[PDB]
Amino acid sequence: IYCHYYKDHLRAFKCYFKAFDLDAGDYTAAKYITETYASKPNWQAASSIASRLIKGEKAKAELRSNNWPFRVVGIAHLEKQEESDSIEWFQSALRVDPNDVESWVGLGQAYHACGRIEASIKVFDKAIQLRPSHTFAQYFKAISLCDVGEYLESLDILEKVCQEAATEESFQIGLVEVLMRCSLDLYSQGFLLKSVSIAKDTIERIKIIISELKCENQQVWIYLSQVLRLFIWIESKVDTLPVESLVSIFENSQFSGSEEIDSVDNIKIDTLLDSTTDDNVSIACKFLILASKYSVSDQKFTDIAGTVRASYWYNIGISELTAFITLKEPQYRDAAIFAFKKSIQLQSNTSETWIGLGIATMDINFRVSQHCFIKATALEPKATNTWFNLAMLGLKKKDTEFAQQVLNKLQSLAPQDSSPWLGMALILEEQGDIIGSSKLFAHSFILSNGRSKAAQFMYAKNVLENHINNGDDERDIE
Amino acid sequence: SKVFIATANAGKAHDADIFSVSACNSFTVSCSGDGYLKVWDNKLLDNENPKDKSYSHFVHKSGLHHVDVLQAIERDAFELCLVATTSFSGDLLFYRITREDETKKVIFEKLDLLDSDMKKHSFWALKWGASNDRLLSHRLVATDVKGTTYIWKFHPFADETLNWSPTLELQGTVESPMTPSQFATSVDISERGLIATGFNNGTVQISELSTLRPLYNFESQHSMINNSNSIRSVKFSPQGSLLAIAHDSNSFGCITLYETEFGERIGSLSVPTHSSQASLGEFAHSSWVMSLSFNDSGETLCSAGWDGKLRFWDVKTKERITTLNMHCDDIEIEEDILAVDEHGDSLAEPGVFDVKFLKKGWRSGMGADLNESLCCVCLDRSIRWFREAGGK
């Protein structure tokens, strides 16, 4: 009566709530209450009503036709970030109404949270198949596609969406994500020149985000940070780097600023471009730092246990360190150590920060650098980088045997990496057993498959040093 | 599904070396040095000799060393099937193919599309550009001994209701970048509207099909002895921006992969081949790579070498998936096995003149999972067909 005739929401709700408690077998009440709470939104309640109804088994006949209880429990489980539990519910809901789009979407989203990624692809694909006017399904499908590694489709999707609803943030950020992932991937796989193009593209997109939406995620700045590295690493097209776009990207976004960090590196948006006679590379470095540094613990953000602060200072540390290694200027080293120090206190369990600290301490005093590397090896035992860096320090202090021992340990650990073999070679070229050294440089290069600069360089050098005056004839194919 | 298994054979298909082979939905056409074009029905029924469903037709006295066929369904009503060929004379011949009313026998109609000024050119390679929204009109690319690429547009109808009258409009040319100009040994055109032109000096030039503008050109390495390196075949990847270049390093065949956005070298396909007796070398084939072909998916690259081996590589990992060894006695008909040639040389392991991937459904087979297929022509005057053991 209240629901249809008197138009009294509160009283009707109270009544139905009073009813369900006594009956538990009347579809109507459950539906009204659930619908009311679904809009609130308070899913922890709807999950209770719905679950109670389903478990009741007093409406087995009604639920053979309408699927909302299952869905509701599922969604409730989704928003608790217990996706694995969510599946059995969605899967069951769709068995009733296989045309229920949002349940497919939810299901695929749950799959994606269980690394059933290709399945996610398929689910979202069906979701779109039903409702092709669905933007979120396309988004999710795009991301999953990106995760599986098919960037083209992902990008066509995300661009096609981003055009259609440029008002929304998630889509744009997604475009950036997929783009930079494409960049790093294509860089890693050897497509060096195209990587830069994708980098320029994605930075332009980031500029567009900051200018069009003024939308500030923690992620965009990391994305930019990761993209910029490419200009730094591959100097050939470092001139492609758009200064203007960057200046705009930084000028538009508002950062409170950190004097303690800024004072170490001497980098501000107004200051860095003021310098004259500095190469594009250094400019890129400065932008890398500024970007990594500008990343925002935005308003209304809830940092769980404060890991994010550590990640922030850490990222800053890595960036500073990159600048230091690239430019060989102490400010970036001091800044790097400072940042890693700041990050360490906040966290103190992540192996990866101690590594950076160790790297940043190789020159000043080895004992601490070692100490860091050792702590790192202890904090992540499966980490192969640590041991190698430590070995390289081992070489730095001219301890052959040690470095060789560590490197042997690595060959034991991970023989697929080119690095350890290269190190082992270098030791032997310093040692003088040059034939075996050449064998090793060769093997290292071969395993590298063009991954590392030093491998290629050292290989070529060694090939020459061997075959320049040993009396080779032009006929010898090899 | 990268395991191919042989389906039908025709031995002694010609009286002289078969140089090029091509196919479409309806048939597989093979040209040879006897100047005869040979249409082989793709649609065969169990245990039927391909030669029973082979239709042959003369073309030029000198012989033909390149053939390509274009089959489209032009208007919603009309079916278009057109074979183009280059003869050793250099002449570019065109033949419309159609089938008899009831007999379903093949009928050739030599079409005359070129003007007298054009006919004077000595063409070598050719390729048909299907109407894949590149522009709306079917295009034809060809190469001459002077190192120029000719680009025509092919209009089968008169000013757009529909009547049959074919015309080839010369869109224009793309001259080689080098000087002296080199011999344009092969050509290909991509789905995204790019022409690749391969010269005999290890140089390849990438240009736009639509705008006839050259975009760039790259070269192949190890140039110690000038006459060594030359490009045998170039083929675009359907899927990606990839381009596979097959070139010689004197006495050996090499496949190099370039990506076409910025046109850089991304890898090279090789396997342990023979060098210096006991030693092991890194080439694609112990002898020259004669021709390339990509599967529909673009994941597999099949290479036909002069060493009588068809090698199928995986493009993504750049490693080799599998290898097929050609033999004179693979042929199902004993009387058609060509053990030794005219001079009494042995053709036990006959080099592969050419290879081609056939799309799923072209080659009809009984009680086999409808799948992709393969075709190749080999020095023993033999034409072989395989199917890709797979599923659908």
Curated annotation (Swiss-Prot), chain A:
Q: What does this protein do?
A: Component of the SKI complex involved in 3'-mRNA degradation pathway. Represses dsRNA virus propagation by specifically blocking translation of viral mRNAs, perhaps recognizing the absence of CAP or poly(A). Essential for cell growth only in the presence of M1 replicon.
Gene name of this polypeptide: SKI3
What else the UniProt entry mentions is: Present with 11900 molecules/cell in log phase SD medium.
* Signal peptide from the UniProt entry: none
Q: Where in the cell is it found?
A: Cytoplasm; Nucleus
Enumerate the TPR repeat regions by residue range. Answer: 1-26, 67-100, 101-134, 310-350, 352-383
Task: Indicate the family of this protein.
Answer: Belongs to the SKI3 family.
Task: Share what the entry says about its subunit structure, partners included.
Answer: Component of the SKI complex composed of at least SKI2, SKI3 and SKI8. The SKI complex interacts with SKI7, which makes the link between the SKI complex and the exosome in order to perform mRNA degradation.
**What is the protein name stated in its UniProt record?**
Superkiller protein 3
Portion of the full-length sequence here: 636 to 1113 of 1432
Curated annotation (Swiss-Prot), chain B:
Pfam families attached here?
A: WD40
Entry coiled-coil feature ranges: none
Give the keywords, sorted. Antiviral defense, Chromosome, Cytoplasm, Meiosis, Nucleus, Repeat, WD repeat
Q: Which domain of life is it from?
A: Eukaryota
WD repeat placement = 20-41, 66-100, 125-156, 186-208, 233-259, 291-314, 354-387
State if Nucleus is listed as a keyword.
yes
Instruction: Choose any GO biological process term that the UniProt entry carries and state it.
Output: defense response to virus
Asked whether the UniProt record includes ATP-binding among its keywords, one would answer no
Q: Where in the cell is it found?
A: Cytoplasm; Nucleus; Chromosome
Q: Which InterPro entries match?
A: SKI8 (IPR051510), WD40/YVTN_repeat-like_dom_sf (IPR015943), WD40_repeat_CS (IPR019775), WD40_repeat_dom_sf (IPR036322), WD40_rpt (IPR001680)
GO terms for cellular component: cytoplasm; nuclear chromosome; nucleus; Ski complex
Family of this protein: Belongs to the SKI8 family.
Question: What else does UniProt say about it?
Answer: Present with 1710 molecules/cell in log phase SD medium.
Oligomeric form and interacting partners: Component of the SKI complex composed of at least SKI2, SKI3 and SKI8. The SKI complex interacts with SKI7, which makes the link between the SKI complex and the exosome in order to perform mRNA degradation.
Q: Relate the protein's function as given in its record.
A: Involved in double-strand break (DSB) formation during meiotic recombination through stabilization of SPO11 association with meiotic chromosome and helping SPO11 to recruit other DSB proteins like REC102 and REC104 to meiotic chromosomes. Also a component of the SKI complex involved in 3'-mRNA degradation pathway. Represses dsRNA virus propagation by specifically blocking translation of viral mRNAs, perhaps recognizing the absence of CAP or poly(A). Essential for controlling the propagation of M double-stranded RNA (dsRNA) and thus for preventing virus-induced cytopathology.
Q: What is this protein called?
A: Antiviral protein SKI8
